[PDB]
Design a protein around this ligand. Structure first.
Ligand code: HEA
Ligand code: HEA
Ligand SMILES: CCCCCCCCCCO[C@@H]1O[C@H](CO)[C@@H](O[C@H]2O[C@H](CO)[C@@H](O)[C@H](O)[C@H]2O)[C@H](O)[C@H]1O
Ligand SMILES: CCCCCCCCCCO[C@@H]1O[C@H](CO)[C@@H](O[C@H]2O[C@H](CO)[C@@H](O)[C@H](O)[C@H]2O)[C@H](O)[C@H]1O
Ligand SMILES: CCCCCCCCCCO[C@@H]1O[C@H](CO)[C@@H](O[C@H]2O[C@H](CO)[C@@H](O)[C@H](O)[C@H]2O)[C@H](O)[C@H]1O
Ligand SMILES: CCCCCCCCCCO[C@@H]1O[C@H](CO)[C@@H](O[C@H]2O[C@H](CO)[C@@H](O)[C@H](O)[C@H]2O)[C@H](O)[C@H]1O
Ligand SMILES: CCCCCCCCCCO[C@@H]1O[C@H](CO)[C@@H](O[C@H]2O[C@H](CO)[C@@H](O)[C@H](O)[C@H]2O)[C@H](O)[C@H]1O
Ligand SMILES: CCCCCCCCCCO[C@@H]1O[C@H](CO)[C@@H](O[C@H]2O[C@H](CO)[C@@H](O)[C@H](O)[C@H]2O)[C@H](O)[C@H]1O
Ligand SMILES: CCCCCCCCCCCCC
Ligand SMILES: CCCCCCCCCCCCC
Ligand SMILES: CCCCCCCCCCCCC
Ligand SMILES: CCCCCCCCCCCCC
Ligand SMILES: CCCCCCCCCCCCC
Ligand SMILES: CCCC[C@@H](O)[C@@H](O)CO
Ligand SMILES: [Ca+2]
Ligand SMILES: [Cl-]
Ligand SMILES: [Cu+]
Ligand SMILES: [Cu+]
Ligand SMILES: [Cu+]
Ligand SMILES: [Mg+2]
Ligand SMILES: [O-]
Lengths: 256, 535
């Protein structure tokens, strides 16, 4: 499988999109970025111009005005218009994100100190997912020859250290996945940048997110609410596969 | 002598707060240097568990030199303790004491023509509560804490159940520190409000009060509502930890998310409390060095009032991924966007003030112009973050760290530096050397931008907050960010050299007003320094 949902050296953009929701985030952010880069350049060029034009050597006698009504009206309404425009594109995207559709696949995720537990209630599958290199796999949260070997064996490389887990959450491509997220002990947060999803895993609460992956591959997230000593060391691996490979993975877990 | 610490005069108390805030600022900045040493490269090299086997002093020095990864067992607890220490010191024991406690106490009474403040004894007590709070915060770092080590690794906002399950009593000491800070702020706020209302000079009507005095007045009101709420939130943590309550524990029927609502109800106002006095200083400085009266005095006052008021109805934008309903998320997104209008606008008034003026690029003016640029860069990423759909991606990433170091951290810092250079002659009778002030500015300006701009990239690439270590792909921009931090630190040590020089052998100030006629408020009417008894 292709490693897609990961940071890339020196990157300045988002991680690749692999869901319709992530696509929407990329578009909305790109739209707002144009606007705020325009606002910033504007403000910056005004300051630099004013300093050049009205420097004490060039403008020896200062003006005394403290009002300009048409300008004050313009500079109040224009921001209001800008925000209404943003909100108009932004709220539909928000509604799409947060309205949970009917699930093809249901996964229940539980955050623990410091690992994730996955249950597929329809399939009677459950398992735990530890960072490769955590105490669970024989390590102590650092790279070493043994850890590199384990990364290789699991189908990764040393570059995926801190991202790759011993087990992965496997799902089929082009299906609606609904994830129910909770915490077992403290608050954790479950996320996959490539899917445009993040949801805190709060003890006592069950919260839902959805995604539909649009291509096969490997996608990583990392725990996103400080949860103690190994917060930096309990990541998330999702493998998106064909319907048939997903079924094959399911049958591998079936006890006869 | 220790006749400084028993003084009740607003000017002496102001000076005490500035120096103390500066010293705590140095400690907290030093934490960030250590933080950026560890983040400079992937793999853990400094915060090694092996250093714990040594003594406290021996372990300290060993942890300042890098080890090979093979000799360094990562110690995440130390990372967590350092960043929590950095955040708490900054938010409770540095910038507000400097701006509100320091410049607020020194200058607001001067600006309104008050010869004394309503409660000089209460003012002196506020300072001592600040010092006691600082001492406890620092003590918590050396107290039995989480994971069988010292200190609390819980984040500056202390989310339960993590904060309530952290072992030892380090966390209880930190909660007490915060109680003492709140008390200091509340006493100060009561003093500021009563002085402002009862002790203005004859003729000094509400429409003639300088913008800085207004900024302090508005800030004081924010404190009285926000700080008691925080005191509630942290007392409930204290009782969950020690007295058998289960406010935030699901097993007893509690909800950890309740804490977040209460904490953030304080937590938003807190940032406006930080920045409002910096707005006041910027207004005084720009008017002086543009040689032109402030554009739209009354809109400036009303914008500050509106920001103050609206800052109480936006808190849950800090909770978009915590499990808020779609209705809640939509509301808070819209309330947040609204507050962006009075706030982002004051920027235009500051530019309009410069427009048509006769601009002198002295050190205080450079800080003020730096403020306008940097507060804009920060405010504008705030707008991005207000959009809940995009915050889904950015929340708890370095993009948020970049934002707040931009609007808030550097805004308060550039406002503080603007005040120091603006007012040091007035407070001390000695003038700073101009070339050194400018060099400080350019070093800090380049340093701070190199530190924080690349953190936007790290966040867009999905780097989470509160991590001792990170995937190798994040290496380039963490390296740049760290070099920026080291240059900023160099600029701050140079600054402390500038202050030492100024106070020991700076050129003697001989004028009441050593700037120009457009520094038109009452402090510039008094001697440098002012007499023990003013007006
Ligand atoms: C100085 C204090 C300060 C200020 C003024 C702001 C300003 C703003 N903040 Fe920021 N914020 C913080 C301090 C501050 N912030 C802190 C400390 C945190 C995180 C704390 C933590 O988690 O540890 C945070 C986090 C934070 C979040 C949560 C992020 C997350 O956790 O995922 C959000 C979400 O909406 C947000 C939004 C905004 C917005 C919309 C503005 C707006 O008010 C900005 C207004 C815009 C400008 C100033 C730009 C200039 C504008 C113009 C020149 C023209 C005006 C035109 C338009 C507005 C269209 N902020
Ligand atoms: C005013 C608030 C403030 C200020 C000034 C700073 C200053 C700095 N911060 Fe801070 N930061 C916070 C508030 C602030 N911070 C908070 C609340 C957090 C969250 C903690 C948490 O996660 O719980 C945080 C977290 C935080 C992180 C993320 C930690 C993590 O998630 O793991 C990082 C990473 O580099 C960082 C770095 C720095 C650096 C390099 C500086 C500085 O070195 C930048 C250079 C600036 C200077 C050199 C000048 C400083 C001047 C003063 C402080 C004024 C002193 C007073 C007088 C002179 C009178 N900080
Ligand atoms: C949104 C971004 C905007 C950033 C702000 C920077 C732009 C500021 C432009 C100021 O415009 C000036 O306003 C003055 C006052 O309104 C006008 O003076 C006019 O009115 C004065 C007031 O009576 C008279 O003294 C003058 O002679 C007369 O020219 C002047 O023509 C006009 O150029
Ligand atoms: O105002 C709200 O705006 C939403 C966003 O514009 C609407 O959601 C509508 O549009 C969303 C995005 O197109 C869909 O997800 C919703 O199903 C649909 O009700 C919603 O009705 C409306 O009250
Ligand atoms: C009749 C039946 C009676 C019940 C008997 C059960 C006895 C076995 C319980 C084992 O307990 C586990 O011990 C681990 C090792 O100490 C813990 O790992 C914890 O500590 C590790 C080492 O610090 C971390 O890496 C892990 O993430 C963290 O979960 C783990 O949580 C805990 O559940
Ligand atoms: C019919 C049979 C009767 C059974 C009765 C036995 C009762 C068992 C008590 C369970 O409490 C455990 O205490 C451990 C020790 O305090 C904890 O380990 C924690 O603390 C250890 C260090 O003390 C670490 O090594 C672990 O990583 C960390 O999980 C562990 O989580 C917790 O569940
Ligand atoms: C690290 C931040 C430094 C903040 C700068 C503070 C400068 C103020 C010092 C002024 O001290 C003054 O000294 C005068 C005799 O020289 C006398 C006066 O009563 C006293 O107030
Ligand atoms: C005046 C500003 C103070 C700045 C202090 C900065 C200290 C810089 C320490 C750099 O040490 C490096 O650390 C790396 C591991 O991170 C090693 O890989 C590298 O071999 C070593 O050279
Ligand atoms: C595909 C590369 C996109 C790079 C965008 C840079 C983002 C910087 C965000 C900060 C903007 C503040 C004005
Ligand atoms: C639909 C538009 C959303 C309103 C935006 C708020 C502007 C202030
Ligand atoms: C225990 C090591 C902390 C080092 C602090 C640097 C300042
Ligand atoms: C062989 C290791 C490279 C040496 C670099 C160590 C520099 C450490 C600087 C510590 C100074 C404290 C701020
Ligand atoms: C590719 C843009 C570089 C930005 C460096 C921070 C200033
Ligand atoms: C693809 C194989 C399906 C096996 C199915 O019966 C199990 O997932 C149920 O436990
Ligand atoms: Ca490192
Ligand atoms: Cl007084
Ligand atoms: Cu976690
Ligand atoms: Cu975590
Ligand atoms: Cu806020
Ligand atoms: Mg969070
Ligand atoms: O905030």
């Amino acid at each position: 499988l292709e490693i897609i949902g990961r940071p890339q050296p020196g990157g300045t953009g988002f991680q690749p999109s692999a869901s319709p929701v992530a696509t929407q985030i990329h578009w909305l952010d790109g739209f707002i970025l144009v606007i705020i880069a325009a606002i910033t350049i504007f403000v910056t060029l005004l300051i630099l111009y004013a300093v050049w034009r009205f420097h004490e050597k060039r403008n020896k006698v200062p003006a005394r005005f403290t009002h300009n009504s048409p300008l004050e009206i313009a500079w109040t309404i224009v921001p209001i218009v800008i925000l209404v425009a943003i909100g108009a594109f932004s709220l539909p995207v928000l509604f799409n994100q947060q309205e949970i559709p009917e699930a093809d696949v249901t996964v229940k995720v539980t955050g623990y100190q410091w690992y994730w537990g996955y249950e597929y209630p329809d399939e009677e599958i459950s398992f735990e997912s530890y960072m490769i290199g955590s105490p669970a796999t024989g390590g102590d949260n650092r790279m070493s020859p043994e850890v590199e070997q384990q990364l290789i064996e699991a189908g990764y490389s040393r570059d995926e250290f801190l991202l790759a887990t011993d087990t992965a959450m496997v799902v089929p491509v082009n299906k609606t996945v609904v994830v129910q997220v909770t915490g077992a002990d403290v608050i954790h947060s479950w996320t996959v940048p490539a899917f445009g999803v993040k949801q805190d895993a709060v003890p006592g609460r069950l919260a839902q997110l959805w995604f539909r992956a649009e291509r096969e591959g490997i996608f990583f997230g990392q725990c996103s609410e400080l949860c103690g000593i190994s917060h930096a060391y309990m990541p998330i691996t999702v493998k998106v596969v064909s319907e048939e490979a997903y079924a094959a993975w399911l049958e591998q877990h079936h006890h006869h | 002598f220790t006749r400084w610490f028993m003084s009740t005069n607003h000017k002496d108390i102001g000076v005490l707060y500035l120096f103390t805030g500066g010293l705590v600022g140095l400690i907290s900045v030093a934490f960030t240097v250590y933080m950026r040493m560890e983040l400079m490269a992937p793999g853990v090299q400094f915060m090694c568990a092996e250093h714990l086997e040594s003594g406290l002093v021996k372990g300290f020095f060993q942890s300042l030199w890098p080890s090979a990864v093979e000799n360094c067992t990562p110690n995440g607890h130390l990372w967590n303790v350092m960043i929590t220490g950095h955040g708490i010191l900054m938010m409770f024991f540095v910038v507000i004491p400097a701006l509100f406690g320091g410049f607020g106490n020194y200058f607001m009474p001067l600006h309104i023509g008050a010869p004394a403040m309503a409660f000089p004894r209460m003012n002196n007590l506020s300072y001592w509560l600040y010092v006691a709070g600082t001492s406890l915060a620092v003590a918590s770092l050396f107290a039995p804490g989480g994971n069988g080590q010292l200190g609390s690794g819980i984040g500056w906002v202390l989310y339960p159940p993590l904060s309530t399950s952290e072992s030892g009593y380090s966390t209880d000491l930190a909660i007490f520190a915060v109680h003492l800070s709140g008390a200091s702020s509340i006493l100060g706020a009561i003093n500021m409000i009563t002085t402002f209302l009862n002790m203005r000079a004859p003729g000094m009507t509400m429409h003639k009060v300088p913008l800085f005095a207004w900024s302090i007045f508005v800030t004081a009101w924010l404190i009285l509502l926000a700080l008691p709420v925080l005191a509630g939130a942290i007392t409930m943590l204290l009782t969950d930890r020690n007295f058998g309550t289960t406010f935030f524990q699901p097993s007893g029927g509690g909800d950890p998310v309740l804490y977040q609502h209460i904490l953030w109800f304080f937590g938003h106002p807190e940032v406006y409390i930080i920045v409002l006095p910096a707005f006041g200083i910027v207004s005084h400085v720009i008017a002086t060095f543009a040689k032109k009266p402030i554009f739209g005095y009354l809109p400036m006052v009303y914008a500050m009032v509106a920001i103050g008021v609206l800052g109480f109805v936006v808190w849950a934008h800090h909770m978009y991924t915590a499990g808020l309903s779609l209705t809640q998320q939509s509301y808070f997104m819209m309330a947040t966007m609204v507050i962006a209008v009075p706030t982002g606008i004051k920027i235009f008034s500051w530019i309009a003030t410069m427009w048509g003026g006769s601009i002198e690029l002295k050190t205080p003016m450079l800080w003020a112009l730096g403020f306008l640029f940097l507060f804009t860069v920060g405010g504008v990423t705030g707008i991005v973050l207000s959009q809940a759909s995009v915050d889904r991606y950015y929340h708890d990433t370095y993009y948020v760290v970049a934002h707040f170091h931009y609007v808030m951290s550097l805004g308060a810092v550039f406002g503080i530096f603007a005040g120091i250079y603006f007012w040091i002659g007035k407070m001390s009778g000695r003038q700073y050397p101009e070339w050194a002030g400018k060099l400080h500015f350019w070093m800090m300006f380049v340093g701070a931008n190199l530190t924080f701009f690349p953190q936007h990239f790290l966040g867009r690439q999905g780097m989470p907050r509160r991590y001792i270590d990170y995937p190798e792909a994040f290496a380039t921009w963490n390296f740049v960010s760290s070099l920026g931090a080291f240059l900023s630190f160099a600029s701050f040590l140079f600054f402390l050299g500038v202050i030492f020089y100024t106070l020991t052998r700076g050129a003697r100030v001989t004028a009441n007003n050593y700037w120009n006629e457009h520094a038109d408020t009452l402090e510039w009417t008094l001697t440098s320094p002012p007499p023990e008894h003013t007006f």
